[PDB]
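In the laboratory, one determines a bound structure by crystallizing the protein with its ligand and collecting diffraction data. In a computational setting the workflow is compressed into a single prediction: the sequence and the ligand go in, and a structural description comes out. We illustrate the idea with calcium ion.
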Amino acid sequence: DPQDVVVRLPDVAVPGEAVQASARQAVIHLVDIAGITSSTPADYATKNLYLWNNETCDALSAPVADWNDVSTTPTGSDKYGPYWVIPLTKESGCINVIVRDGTNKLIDSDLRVSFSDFTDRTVSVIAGNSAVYDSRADAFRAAFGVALADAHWVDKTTLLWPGGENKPIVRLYYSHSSKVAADSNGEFSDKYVKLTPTTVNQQVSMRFPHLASYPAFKLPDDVNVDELLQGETVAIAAESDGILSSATQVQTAGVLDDTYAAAAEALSYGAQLTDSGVTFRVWAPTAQQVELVIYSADKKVIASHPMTRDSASGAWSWQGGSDLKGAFYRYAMTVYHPQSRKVEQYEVTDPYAHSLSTNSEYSQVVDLNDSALKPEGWDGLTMPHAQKTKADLAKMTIHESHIRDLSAWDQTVPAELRGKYLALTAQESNMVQHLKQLSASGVTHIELLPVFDLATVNEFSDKVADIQQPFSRLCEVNSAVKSSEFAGYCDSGSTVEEVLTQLKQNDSKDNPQVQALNTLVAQTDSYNWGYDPFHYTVPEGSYATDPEGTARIKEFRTMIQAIKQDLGMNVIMDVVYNHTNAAGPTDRTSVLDKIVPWYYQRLNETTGSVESATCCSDSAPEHRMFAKLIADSLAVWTTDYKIDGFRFDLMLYHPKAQILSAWERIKALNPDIYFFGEGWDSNQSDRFEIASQINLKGTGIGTFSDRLRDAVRGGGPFDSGDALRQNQGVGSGAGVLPNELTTLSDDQARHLADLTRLGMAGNLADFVLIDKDGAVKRGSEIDYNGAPGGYAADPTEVVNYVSKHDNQTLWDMISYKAAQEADLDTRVRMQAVSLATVMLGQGIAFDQQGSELLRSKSFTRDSYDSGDWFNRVDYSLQDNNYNVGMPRSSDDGSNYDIIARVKDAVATPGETELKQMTAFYQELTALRKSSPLFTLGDGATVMKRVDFRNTGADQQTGLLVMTIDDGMQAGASLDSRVDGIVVAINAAPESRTLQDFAGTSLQLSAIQQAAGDRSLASGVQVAADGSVTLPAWSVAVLELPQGESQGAGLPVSSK
Ligand SMILES: OC[C@H]1O[C@H](O[C@H]2[C@H](O)[C@@H](O)[C@@H](O[C@H]3[C@H](O)[C@@H](O)[C@@H](O[C@H]4[C@H](O)[C@@H](O)[C@@H](O)O[C@@H]4CO)O[C@@H]3CO)O[C@@H]2CO)[C@H](O)[C@@H](O)[C@@H]1O
Ligand SMILES: [Ca+2]
Ligand SMILES: [Ca+2]
Ligand SMILES: [Ca+2]
Ligand SMILES: [Ca+2]
Ligand SMILES: [Ca+2]
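The predicted complex, in structure-token form:
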């Protein structure tokens, strides 16, 4: 433009160091940005440092310990500001600094100047900035160069940025090929688009509520966003004299959606078999170039095809021969990445990959419909359990499982199928026969921990050593062991398993040697939960016998087929769309963020950094093209792999609307698909309505309930130390069998029982019960740590559980909490009593694999990387993996003392207890499915039929008494054998007698009668007059038999 100002640096040299510290000295410069804008020489007499020694930093020699002393004035100064020479007692360590003008802080942050990061002890700072810089030049270019990324190009014409508020020059500079910066003289010569102040739209406000308080700026209606977005984009502000105010990078995901998403959403992505051949398509609306690289089976480039860019969508496409089926491929990108600030060139696998090479290095063209990739009969495979009505869904009884947890240890699984999808076909193995038994008794669904492509297992078998293999193999592949306390064992000729067993002997809270070795094993074994997504829509390769190419696809479907057809269970998949394993332009597992940088990840609105609140690299499902990729992904798992439902990890990091959108999309494919998820944190309500327990009321989207879970288990997931033992649950005898440490009051115990009863009636917000004080309360009025307790509209929106893959197993919680006088048999009943609140409740029942086997992880709280050793499940029923070493010290170190106290209170369960627990478990699940009354499905039907006795301040503590009405009132006899059901769970050491049903013709269920001495109700007595005496630690299911007509049943009372 002819006129208008040239934005430029301050006309002054980039400063050097004023002085350098000598011995026993440190030096601090204050780079006076405002006085570098010159005119008069500023005066620095009022500048002073406050300097003091504490315990973290003690290197100062003459620190003044009086805040009102402003005498530590600059040693000298020049045009760039003052500096201080600080005497020291030493040259290592650190010093504490506060920079002041008088007693006012110019930097409102205690400065830790550590001579480790700063070898020459000569640092610089700027006012209003907590950063400690290496040199005055660095600090100067921080102030007068591009920093952060707080500008937000949110649609075509709207740009939000605080740094340009009320300032004369505000513009959007850009360079196709290089990083915007001042030129040889000192001016910003690059092209720009001028910005005018404006007011945020109602659509920008609705779209980005967490930004609607940013100062808004308008772009020319004719601006060419295609060209701007090709390279680095940098918003700049400047004074009247053209001096640079601030300059920041731009986040563009808003405008990318405004510009391209409408067109890009109508397209299909990945390597797609058609009639004419194969269409490749990838979305890369900012890339300068995309070439499709075709690879031979041995990974030699055999063709390279520049792709065609569609300017409306920003998608790139290429069409080739149908002979490309089976070919490996990547996308060679030429694309600017805001994090590196450079135009990167790298090859990336397809985010829409549906097949992969070993370890996910290349994607592969595949037609998932090929009969070659299907087990015989696949096309006719049906769901063994219905999921159509709410009553169908309430029957769901989930068994949460992991591919290695299932088979890694089962000697009766062929050695080569161990830890593999195909282990589920080993029809005579202990593991599969055990699962068949569980299914026959009423476990209806297997939920699989991550079986999409995860990043954290090396699928090259030659770089892996598992504990069943020689210890010398572990030394080969894990160079770290050779320099470790176990190095002597490389010669042993014994397996790692055999070694770890020997380490149990001397293992203790002082000598945690089992865990010490296992930490090394964990680095290079085959084991991980897998919450670490590499590709969302390919199976994991390490669980295939052959991870190269398409074999894993047929092996996966063969597993799926055996579960439905041979075990008789539906399959749920854990999915993890809330984060990616990595982001940025360099990491091997950064896929989405290499192709469309800063679009698929959720970013800090100020720094532009990829957030990590999930654990890892947070994703952005509020962005339209990630929403599409999620829905497309689930479509494949639904249709091509016949997955019956999905559990979303950290679902509350997703918009409610996005999750409902994905659900309507998938229901168009199969109406019976069930969606549910877990969540507690997020802190994303500022950006959108999150998909949380509270917000999902009425949607039919299920959520894990932590209410009954914590009431029955006791305590909470963040307890540590003695609190693990004091915070007894209903299942472990809160109030009624106190241990030596607890101070649980009767009121507290009765509070837990309110939460438990609420959960057994499906945790509905509007269920009305009598609370711990005899007060009438709606479910939402029962407190849960501040939140409303009951939150749902139907029991099918609530997933009850008392054990899960994450946090301590149920058995380990009982071991922490059970009084010394509870013997081994009483603790087994505690496990069953605990599980009974889930299995006999109206919420969907969920449980961890092996709870029927008293599963233990040796007190490990978080076993995601704790290997075969601590996650062992022994389907030969020799033990429950209890007491196999102290858990990992890095996470449970603070628990070693309480563990040592409690650990050896009773014997370790052996085969007798394991068989007894399993019978108890099957008894519970056979009861759950013995009557429609347990699984009403609909929350209004729950309210009209479900009540509780033994409530109020004078209840018998720990006795849970639920009634389910099948009588003349409420409605019709959904159950032709009974007019009502009584569920009684006597979680207490005393025998108890019920009088609430005197004269009523009550009788024990046939299932519990059949089990005889093995029943949870063994010893129950029903007297002639209908009074019922319940043993200690018992579970009893009673029914009023039904006559030629429908009896009066157990009418609910209007409270
Ligand atoms: O070597 C001693 C300590 O020196 C430094 O502490 C400084 C602070 O940085 C100054 O800000 C100030 O502290 C004020 C404080 O800001 C003021 O609010 C008030 O503190 C209140 C406090 O708000 C309130 O929560 C409650 O605790 O009452 C306090 C007073 O009892 O008063 C303070 C005194 O001026 O001055 C101190 C000087 O000691 C340095 O930051 C420390 O790390 C260091 O240990
Ligand atoms: Ca230096
Ligand atoms: Ca993998
Ligand atoms: Ca591992
Ligand atoms: Ca935020
Ligand atoms: Ca009936």
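The domain at 947-1055 is CATH 2.60.40.1180 (Immunoglobulin-like). Keep in mind that any predicted model is a hypothesis to be tested, not a measurement.
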